Ligand binder design. Structure first.
Ligand SMILES: [Ca+2]
Ligand SMILES: [Ca+2]
Ligand SMILES: [Ca+2]
Ligand SMILES: [Ca+2]
Ligand SMILES: [Ca+2]
Ligand SMILES: [Ca+2]
Ligand SMILES: [Ca+2]
Ligand SMILES: [Ca+2]
Ligand SMILES: [Ca+2]
Lengths: 450, 451, 451
């Protein structure tokens, strides 16, 4: 049919099922289109803006938007949210005295933000010295995704202008507090910026637009997903449907499918490869808040697969993905600087290819040269014991020595232990675990925490 | 036919193949038109703006844009991107202390910028003293490509005021470093300016137009190309198709074709000349970043020709062309002040006409008067040895004495040697190379590099 | 026919050949329209702005533009171009110290310029003190061509505001340099102003119409021509076609035709008089830049007439003309206070009517009262010698005595000798030339040069 209820040039019959854009016209999706590299899109048949962003479904699917917006946002289910922050580099105190800092804007979203006017807070400890908003001297004309202002290869801009006047901490009690060695933290509160929309004459106009009009809408119709790759962080929002409203037609997608859509991850049959780094559920650590934790726990009892990535995405969910710094699977990736002890690769019952046949105990000596001091670390792994009759205890050396006992189940079970390392010139980290009999180990990961 | 999906007054069939403009209407391209000056255009038939610049395909092809835009930007695949920078000419500081500087704006793109307003950072050593924005006294009304404000013959303008205010370091601790052999630098973070457009009434309006809209769009679709000839620097961006997009119809062009389109260089059969200076691969030293270098390395092994200029241009590639300061080919150009030793021109196995027949060793005493001190240089040339039984070692005098060995291949191979010369009142540079037997040399050059 | 590609109310055929405007409609030009006082217009048939100026071909040809725009701009080839500078009449230093100047704006173009807001630079010796933009006090409401602001008969306006605050030498070093007798100068980097167009109702609006839009476009579609008559200077820009572009249908005219079109000089057969004073090739010297010099020198060898005025115009050429101050032709003009020596007017082989029959040597005693000190002067003349066997040497008294030899050819040859005279209370300038036999001399000129 050709019925268009929401008037966005895409018939509702195509929007309900899969659809793709070919020569600027929507066509019914076919299973043979994946060979050329095409993609399958779904969206609600009642709304012109499924994800809430200022671009419609046809504009996002056909790529009729600003060319600096990532292809991760061309899917109508992924909002074109620019997540702009402020990073502080250096602090200068001189003569009361005056305070200025060298800052540099950061963007981690999926869209550009013209005319960036960040508002930041100068907090020392709880007390906020003075709120500052960028003047005409500290406005970023362009800020592309995954790029900074000033861009790489340029010194950070100075932030001294106040009100105009200077930033004067007249109260010398703050100076006395700084004498003890306190540091001043710069937190960002709000950021103002534009999008790029084409006028009737074909030019791009960015004056009447404002991202501040679509922040509330995008926040309240989407679920936040954050990916951490050790150095580069990505923040994305994925649209989700309401539970009590029968008139909300937003498509339902699993957490893994949502991750693949948002981060443009390549799926080689079963695994999810982001940039060659495997971000599969077993190969990465996931952190949820309390609400998402209870939602996932409730939904897991009705799932036969008992896999996190198979749970349906829901509005208001929060997900944070942290890629471990060191991860070994004994098959194709082993970045641990020090070789493990009592390891056997002759196995066929592993998670993907093989497992580790341990007979006795495993002890690893990790040098601290490749560690981050004053940082919490969590050790995770998967243990499989069909016997279910061997007790495993773990000894970990840290600021406080940890000794815990583990009871492996018949199938693979994930064990997580938390510890903290303090001081660069401290004792070397010692980790030791013992097994009563023969156990299987796979996917040992080391993850940095806060 | 007569079908234009993109609605830019050019049919899809004409855009898929070659097309040219004849009297305000697009016509099917023919090979006989090239002798009359007509050139063939290709573009994408799904987007009006192929390169992302404000002007459509028809406006660029038919030349219906502002006449100050270079003809090299009439090609739909070349973006009219104005690269405007600020150069510092003098520093005047006096008493705390006040800082006064004389600056001059520089343009290198293919389109003029109206109402220039750069933002500058006054970095001393990593630390940024203050960020300045140009007020109404430092706003350039017009800036044509390859032109400066103030123009040539006019003294540079003075930038010494903040937002009807004064500029001052808030303390003398900066002056302490300034005395201790530190130089305050200047780098432009951003430039704001309008672009020329036409209205219904016919006048050119540059009031509501802004370049900031079309910078993130142009930089995300086009691959940067930079040409440096020692005196003048040209910066260009050439649109390239996305690799993973099946719906992207942007045409694919080679690196050499991209350079020819961007710089409008003359191509007489095989050689490429910019303005009489050859920019052929064997006559210049190309500098690539990591990604472009590895990309070219990957596609090189799959090509029988194995030539850099024959690789297809791709999005995000960065290419820099450094025209050598001294270039000799033993055929028609030898700018070396001192002639070479033990050179025989009686040969027929050269790259273009002849090669160098060396029997023994070659030592060149390069005068220092024509060399820039405190700079790094790279010595490059082409060597051919069918025997593959003679080893070549080089002895070059510099700040650190260099002694390296080379193993010539059967065919012509290009090499590079890196050394640093420091101090105006230093020893003369000595270059010596020895060949075990008879070797063939061609296209010897000296190229300046970053210090 | 009735075909209009560019849609400017004139058919393509009429623009290709000559055309003229009779009763506000374009008609085919005829050879019998000259006697009525009409003129023959030619313009490109692919552009609605042949010269690129804000006005179209029909508006310029029919005279539907401001009456303040001179008649020389009614030719579609010659564009209107306000060339506005700033001249200084008084320099005042008072007390740090305060600096104020009295300035008058000058217009030497072919169009008015409303709302003049010039930007000026203060330089004492190379270094720029500050940059000044005109405030609401110094803005000129109107500036007609060849007029000033304030008008003739009024004292110059004041310029003392740096931004409103007084100007300031920021250091005592400025007074150090003033103690050394250093002169502060004034140069204009740019100028802002409006142009007038009749709106859709019938009123002239100059609010949103800026001249800065049509500066870069006009500079790149025209060649610069300057005429100086000793005291008053006029600048014009004449449109020229591109070289390699086949779609550029801009008509081609010679240097003499371009001068006649730009300055509206009268043609009485062959002679050219600007306003009664000769400006023909033999009656003035043309001062060129480099590129013009090589282009014209290359083009002369392929042309039989071998005259500068017969060279085809081209884009980018810069021409400067300095009408002679002391000039004699022995026919109708001799402004030298002292009569020449050994002069015979009984001849018929002169450039126009008669020549000089010199038998021996000619010496002239020129008083220096009418000579400007600290200025460079050039003596020019035409020599004819069918014998081609006599050597002529010239003795000129100046700061450094000059003695050079000249070898006359069979035909008339132009010779130029350059010298500088310094000091009002200096020795009198002596000019002497000796000829071996009988020589023919005509069009001897003396003209000021750069300081
Ligand atoms: Ca629909
Ligand atoms: Ca829809
Ligand atoms: Ca495994
Ligand atoms: Ca088309
Ligand atoms: Ca097109
Ligand atoms: Ca050769
Ligand atoms: Ca016409
Ligand atoms: Ca016309
Ligand atoms: Ca005569």
């Amino acid at each position: 049919e050709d019925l268009d209820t929401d008037n966005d040039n895409i018939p509702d019959a195509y929007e309900k099922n899969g659809y793709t854009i070919k020569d600027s016209i929507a066509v019914k999706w076919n299973d043979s289109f994946a060979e050329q590299g095409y993609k399958k899109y779904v969206s609600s048949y009642l709304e012109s803006n499924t994800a809430g962003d200022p671009y419609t479904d046809y504009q996002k699917a056909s790529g009729s938007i600003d060319k600096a917006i990532k292809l991760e946002a061309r899917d109508p289910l992924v909002a074109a949210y620019p997540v702009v922050g402020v990073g502080m580099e250096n602090l200068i105190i001189s003569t009361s005295a005056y305070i200025n800092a060298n800052v540099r804007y950061y963007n981690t979203g999926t869209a550009p933000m013209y005319k960036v006017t960040p508002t930041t807070n100068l907090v020392l400890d709880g007390e906020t010295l003075a709120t500052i908003k960028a003047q005409d001297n500290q406005i970023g004309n362009n800020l592309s995704p995954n790029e900074t202002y000033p861009k790489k290869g340029l010194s950070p801009l100075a932030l001294n202008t106040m009100d105009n006047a200077r930033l004067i901490p007249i109260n010398y009690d703050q100076l006395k507090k700084l004498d003890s060695g306190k540091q001043i933290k710069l937190e960002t509160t709000q950021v103002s910026g534009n999008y790029g929309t084409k006028n009737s004459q074909g030019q791009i106009i960015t004056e009447g637009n404002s991202w501040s009009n679509y922040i509330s809408q995008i926040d309240s119709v989407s679920a936040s997903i954050i990916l951490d790759t050790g150095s580069q962080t990505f923040e994305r929002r994925v649209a989700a449907k309401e539970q009590g409203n029968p008139e909300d037609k937003t498509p339902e997608i699993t957490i893994g499918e949502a991750i693949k859509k948002a981060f443009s991850a390549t799926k080689n049959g079963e695994l999810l490869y982001f940039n060659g780094i495997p971000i599969d559920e077993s190969c990465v650590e996931l952190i949820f808040d309390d609400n998402t934790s209870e939602i996932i726990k409730e939904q897991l009892k009705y799932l036969d697969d008992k896999k996190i990535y198979n749970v349906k995405l829901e509005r208001g969910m929060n997900i944070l993905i942290k890629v471990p710094s060191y991860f070994t699977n004994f098959d194709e990736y082993n970045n641990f600087p020090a070789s493990w002890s009592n390891i056997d690769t002759k196995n066929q019952d592993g998670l993907q290819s093989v497992a580790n046949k341990l007979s006795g105990e495993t002890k690893i000596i990790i040098p601290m040269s490749k560690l981050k001091p004053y940082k919490r670390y969590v050790f995770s792994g998967y243990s499989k014991d069909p016997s279910t009759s061997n007790s495993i205890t773990v000894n970990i050396k840290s600021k406080e020595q940890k000794t815990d006992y583990l009871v492996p189940e018949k199938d693979y079970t994930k064990f997580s232990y938390e510890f903290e390392t303090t001081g660069k010139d401290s004792s070397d980290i010692e980790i030791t675990l013992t097994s009563s009999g023969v156990i299987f180990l796979d996917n040992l990961s080391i993850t940095e925490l806060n």
